[PDB]
Design a protein around this ligand. Structure first.
Ligand SMILES: Nc1ncnc2c1ncn2[C@H]1C[C@H](O)[C@@H](COP(=O)(O)O)O1
Ligand SMILES: Nc1ncnc2c1ncn2[C@H]1C[C@H](O)[C@@H](COP(=O)(O)O)O1
Lengths: 520, 520, 123
């Protein structure tokens, strides 16, 4: 693709249409790119004795990058509703990436006024980490994605990565990556950038909730043919009746004693919190009493753990200590914001396959009972994996992460990103972008010294992203209507998912995905 | 179709599947048929001086008939939800009718016990009024349709019709119809009946609500270029300023004064009622104060009138005196039942095209104002049809009527059935059914007298009805989610649209159709 | 009416700066503009309401292009749940630089001739 100055290098493709078996979303946004790090690679690390479990070492690059690992980058609210309310599941298929209508602007502070002018001969550099040789910094819920609202212009994030570290120091096996050591396409105004990607085979997401329960699985009307022991001593308690071994045949009556075929999913107990700031202990325990793990003598918070339900029946006020994902409302400090300023996600559809996050797991025996010894019971707060266990995964939300790169290790278990979504061995590659350095006035005499005098300039253009989604259609013989997402028909102030009096788009609530029901 | 005794003449086809562009519903039920009128055609009429506006004359036939002019005959609740929440509109296309697995039983009261036995050699008679030579008695919301619940067995309705009448007497131009004078197929056990029908071109129903309003149609930001007169006297009211003619250019400000292009629909004011039995007048006025019409000196209640909205904004408690359709809950006297026993339908989606039923229509002038005469205003309570008028039609409900035969007259206006649905010149024909008379013991001596001694017997079998529906797909660029029908996720007593403790199916609420939104 | 041909061309994008007390206006050659047509009528039709901003009766007159706004469903100053929000960035649109242009053709439907006459008789 090569055209002229007064000729656009692309069009605005922002649309979505459905094919009953699949859906194609196209999304275009306007982007702006500054000059990060002053065209310099800078070594970064932790403050000399500021914190210990936060010690780190890495580098900062003059490169920006494109991100669209959020669902609202592609699905308008209305669309998300069509998807959510009609499909057993869904997944990604293809991807088309396009950069175009590029403009390079250089600015000058002459006196007390900034003039901005065109630098037509200036270039910009783009490339894609398709061999995954660069540290994958996406799928970490960072900021700088495409604006949920198409009319919103966004700033392109800067690229930085972390390496291996011993405290604030580094090791010998630490890796330094130069992005100038990658072949990249240079673009002038009227040039453009093309890219296509094909997702791998990754299971459909669960856009459903089970209409049965792991324990309420059998026939309510018939008794089993298996027997269990329910009386160890209790007999005809009158004369000469100390103890006896008695067995009962399973019945719809003994519903939680019947022989079973499957187990609930794994668990890692979280601490229970209440939204009412007075049910809780008068202490500050978000760290000393929260669940966590430690690698190399460094404690890390187990924020979203295994998929566990948020609360039990008849509660809805108790949420796991960070046992779920939380989104911040529009306009809310990054530092200690009120509970009325954030949006907490309820995972109450998986109550049927998974243990509750705050509750125990079950009961294990740990002794050899006899006439001499009384049988001991121990509450299990942590459960690894077991043959027979089944479970559901974390939901995805309109503004949640989509995919995540699966770490290249010797072993994985259930490679589904813990924050939710699609785990990929080879995910959509990273798209790097940066303004090419333009030297200012050079000396008539030759100076070997590092060149530091540059013309200040930023870039702007459009970006387009087209993704094809495969849908799993609903096939239910449920007679009664199912629950659907819907807006309040009530006379309301502002309209949900809209701009306000002074033009600011805002998403009212987090949107789940499990509205339709399937059987176990 | 001709088979044997020990061989079924058909299968149970009760299913529905979607084709994205259309939907096919198949419905099978078990039916029973008695011997109506004792195999006799009886002349019926009004009680000698019982009532005047209810005077009538007609006949009663020994024939039964099949009816499925209700939506719940075909759509399960879940299906209705899929249709309602996804489609701009819909309509009927084809029809397949089948009678099979017929059994004729004859009963005898010997002493004090009734024995029921098989009459294998007995027949039954079926035919279809395809030339519409018989009075069309369907589309009048009668009872005896197919049970909403497939497991429910139903009794087949008896056929009767009305003719022309002068009070309780009849005229010379009155018509007597014998159904034995129609060619009909006679069926033994193992015989069956086949029938196929194709609907005519009838507009899609409105499964949508307008997102704009007839009066809020223009640009909020720009002023018109047309001028109106808004001041007749009011001027610089100080000295020597009695009156003057002043004109203002239309603005977003003068929003209800701007020149217009269209009118709201027609109207026929209904009386306003409140659900709170104490806001109302302490009188009994459901007849003396309700809207009605009269043909041939006979007052008839204008029950569902032209499509008019039920209530204005911020009310929802005032419903038009019978200005809408009302469904009776499961198990509720046909005679004076409480308000908590019926289900009233709210027509509040057509607020944007239609006048309110209880409110006035508008304002008309009726004098020649001058300095001598003060300008008079008259409130218009009744409005015929006008060039420029636009409107919406009555909604259809899961348990509402589907179609209605359009009377064969010289003139029609908007041939949409007033109770709602599809008006057809040539609707699905009537399917008559009756047990063939079986004479009992005859005298060894010849008697000319009318034969009256018959063997008592009834019939039973299955009936199947397959209808193909064309769908109009949703194509909206609405950004925010639309309102959808959904069930209460709340911990509930009984499940909506279900059988209860003693097996009785019950529909909780009337279901509209206008959930999705389209522009004007 | 029968047919229609629409064309946009000779486009110029100007950017202005208030530096001190004087406004300088200069060419932004690399700047674009976005055009599209609501051919599926998915956007509220705001024409045919006698608004202003049409083409000048006199060809020599230059005109300012009107701004787009629409009304939805409302209960007083408040809105309802069935109210519709339309984003025009969610429509595929052609982007034009200087030297690009826009083409469009339309065919009217069968609509009766207007009455350019008066009856010489009376009912
Ligand atoms: N997001 C995602 N990506 C890939 N696989 C998933 C995912 N979620 C669940 N699984 C399941 C599907 C396979 O049966 C299994 C492969 O594990 P393996 O370790 O590859 O043998 O992991
Ligand atoms: N249910 C139904 N059936 C038929 N036509 C309908 C119906 N609802 C609205 N209309 C409209 C469609 C045609 O433009 C018009 C024909 O009227 P005519 O009197 O036939 O010239 O009536």
């Amino acid at each position: 693709g090569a055209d002229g100055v007064g000729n656009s290098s692309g069009n605005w493709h922002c649309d979505s249409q459905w094919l009953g078996d699949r859906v194609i979303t196209t999304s275009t946004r306007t982007w702006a790119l500054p000059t990060y790090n002053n065209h310099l690679y800078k070594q970064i690390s932790s403050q000399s004795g500021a914190s210990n479990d936060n010690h780190y070492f890495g580098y900062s690059t003059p490169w920006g990058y494109f991100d669209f690992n959020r669902f609202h980058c592609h699905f308008s609210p209305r669309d998300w509703q069509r998807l959510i309310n009609n499909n057993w599941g869904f997944r990604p298929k293809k991807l088309s990436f396009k950069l175009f209508n590029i403009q390079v602007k250089e600015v000058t502070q002459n006196d007390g006024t900034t003039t901005i002018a065109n630098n037509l001969t200036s270039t910009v550099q783009v490339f894609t980490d398709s061999e995954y040789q660069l540290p994958y910094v996406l799928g970490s819920a960072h900021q700088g994605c495409l604006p949920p609202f198409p009319a919103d212009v966004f700033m392109v994030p800067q690229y930085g990565y972390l390496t291996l570290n011993n405290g604030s120091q580094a090791v010998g096996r630490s890796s330094f990556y130069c992005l100038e050591y990658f072949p990249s396409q240079m673009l002038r105004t009227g040039n453009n950038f093309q890219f296509s990607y094909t997702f791998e085979d990754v299971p459909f997401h669960s856009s459903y909730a089970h209409s049965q329960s792991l324990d309420r699985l059998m026939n309510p009307l018939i008794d089993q043919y298996l027997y269990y022991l329910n009386r160890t001593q209790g007999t005809t308690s009158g004369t000469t009746n100390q103890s006896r071994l008695l067995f009962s045949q399973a019945g719809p009556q003994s519903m939680s004693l019947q022989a079973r075929n499957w187990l609930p999913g794994p668990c890692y107990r979280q601490q229970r919190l209440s939204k009412t700031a007075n049910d809780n202990n008068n202490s500050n325990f978000p760290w000393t009493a929260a669940s966590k793990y430690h690698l190399n003598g460094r404690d890390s918070l187990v924020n979203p753990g295994p998929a566990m339900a948020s609360h039990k029946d008849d509660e809805e006020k108790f949420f796991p200590m960070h046992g779920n994902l939380i989104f911040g409302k529009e306009g809310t400090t990054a530092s200690n914001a009120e509970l009325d300023n954030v949006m907490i996600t309820d995972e109450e559809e998986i109550r049927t396959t998974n243990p509750v996050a705050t509750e125990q797991y079950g009961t294990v025996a740990n002794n050899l009972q006899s006439s001499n010894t009384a049988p001991t019971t121990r509450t299990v707060n942590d459960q690894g994996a077991l043959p027979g266990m089944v479970w559901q995964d974390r939901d995805v939300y309109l503004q949640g992460p989509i995919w995540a790169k699966i770490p290249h290790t010797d072993g994985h278990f259930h490679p589904s990103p813990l924050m939710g979504g699609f785990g990929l061995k080879h995910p959509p590659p990273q798209i790097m972008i940066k303004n090419t350095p333009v030297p200012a006035n050079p000396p008539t005499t030759f100076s070997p010294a590092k060149f530091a005098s540059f013309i200040t300039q930023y870039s702007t253009g459009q970006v387009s992203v087209e993704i094809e989604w495969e849908l799993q259609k609903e096939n239910s013989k449920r007679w009664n209507p199912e629950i659907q997402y819907t807006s309040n028909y009530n006379k309301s102030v502002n309209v949900d998912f809209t701009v306000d009096t002074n033009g600011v788009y805002s998403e009212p609530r987090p949107i789940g995905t499990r509205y339709l029901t399937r059987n176990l």
